[PDB]
A paper describes a structure:
[name] ([name]) is one of the six G protein-coupled receptors activated by the bioactive lipid, lysophosphatidic acid (LPA). [name] couples to the G proteins such as Gαi, Gαq, and Gα12/13, and transduces various intracellular signals, e.g., increased Ca2+ concentration and actin reorganization by the Rho/ROCK pathway. [name] is widely expressed in several organs to control cell proliferation and survival, cell–cell contact, cell migration, and cytoskeletal morphological changes. [name] is associated with various diseases such as cancer, inflammation, and neuropathic pain, and thus is a pathologically important receptor that is an essential drug target.
[name]-0740556 provides an extensive interaction network with N-term, ECL1, 2, and TMs 2, 3, 5, 6, and 7 of the receptor. The binding site consists of a polar recognition region on the extracellular side and a hydrophobic pocket within the transmembrane region. Two oxygen atoms of the head phosphate form salt bridges with K39N-term and R1243.28 (superscripts indicate Ballesteros–Weinstein numbers). The phosphate group also forms a hydrogen bond with Y34N-term, and is tightly recognized by the positively charged resides K2947.36. By contrast, the long acyl chain fits into the transmembrane pocket in a bent conformation and forms extensive hydrophobic interactions with the receptor. Notably, the aromatic moiety in the middle of the acyl chain is sandwiched between two leucines, L2786.55 and L2977.39. Furthermore, in the acyl chain, the C14 carbon forms a CH–π interaction with W2105.43.
Author numbering: 23 to 81, 83 to 150, 160 to 230, 256 to 323
The structure:
């Protein structure tokens, strides 16, 4: 029993979500903060890629740093397009277009997370251009397939009853998958960096950015998929902004230590 016939209104009304036909103080506030964060991400990551390409000094570690910067740039673009599509604007959507929006978000953040794990793995190995391009194509292939799987097959077009409260169309199975994927990625980063340490400031801030910008989102998604009657829609719009603020901080987290890169920035 599968229904692509209904519009977004049917799916929201099925769920607990609110369409927000009219503009709001909260809607204007989140639009302003989101556009600010997106402008910051785009500018900062454009600067990082320009530097990593202008200097022959940063010609594999800096390739993975620039790949992380490009994924964060894509996250900025995805979040920028998600804005100018919220509040009353969401009411103008269709199933295909809304899936476009959420798929861009999925692939962008998955690419950012995979680049963080790849930089951790390279740092572990360090402690030609073959392994670096192999891991870049693995990161991008995994990001695209992860952002496309719900857009094709893995969503609640067919089970209205069994899917999420926040994403009315993604399923509890997909949200559990994404969140456990991110959780195991974070524990792999923690074990790699702890083994490396066994420097403390760099490790703590690198893990801390990730924990304070993801644990909110991941615990929120697990609550949505596990606990009924846990009012979890309330703190969604700001937790996504925190997840994008992670990609905002990544360019200065992974470029502050390099005095050469600091001198480069011009
Ligand atoms: C697609 C799932 C990927 C995995 C989770 C991503 C994530 C992380 C941290 C906070 C939130 C999320 C997504 C939550 C839904 C996406 C959205 O845009 N929600 C907002 C919540 O107010 C409504 O968007 P809209 O209804 O205004 O279009």
């Amino acid at each position: 029993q599968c229904f692509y016939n209904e519009s977004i209104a049917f799916f929201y009304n099925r769920s607990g979500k609110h369409l927000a036909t009219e503009w709001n103080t909260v809607s204007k506030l989140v639009m302003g903060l989101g556009i600010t964060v997106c402008i910051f991400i785009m500018l900062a990551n454009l600067l990082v890629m320009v530097a990593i390409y202008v200097n022959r000094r940063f010609h594999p570690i800096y390739y993975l740093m620039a790949n992380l910067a490009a994924a964060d740039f894509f996250a900025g673009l995805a979040y920028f397009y998600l804005m100018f599509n919220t509040g009353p604007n969401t009411r103008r959507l269709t199933v295909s277009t809304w899936l476009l929006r959420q798929g861009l978000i999925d692939t962008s953040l998955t690419a950012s997370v995979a680049n963080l794990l790849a930089i951790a793995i390279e740092r572990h190995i360090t402690v030609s251009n073959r392994r670096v391009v192999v891991v870049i194509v693995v990161i991008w292939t995994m990001a695209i397939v992860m952002g496309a799987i719900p857009s094709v097959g893995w969503n609640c077009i067919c089970d209205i009853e069994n899917c999420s409260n926040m994403a009315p169309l993604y399923s509890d199975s997909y949200l559990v998958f994404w969140a456990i994927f991110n959780l195991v990625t974070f524990v792999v980063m923690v074990v790699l960096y702890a083994h490396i340490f066994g420097l403390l400031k760099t490790v703590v801030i690198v893990l801390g950015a990730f924990i304070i910008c993801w644990t909110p989102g991941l615990v929120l998604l697990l609550l949505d998929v596990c606990c009924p009657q846990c009012d979890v829609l309330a703190y969604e719009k700001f937790f996504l902004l925190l997840a994008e603020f992670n990609s905002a901080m990544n360019p200065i987290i992974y470029s502050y230590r390099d005095k050469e890169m600091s001198a480069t920035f011009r």
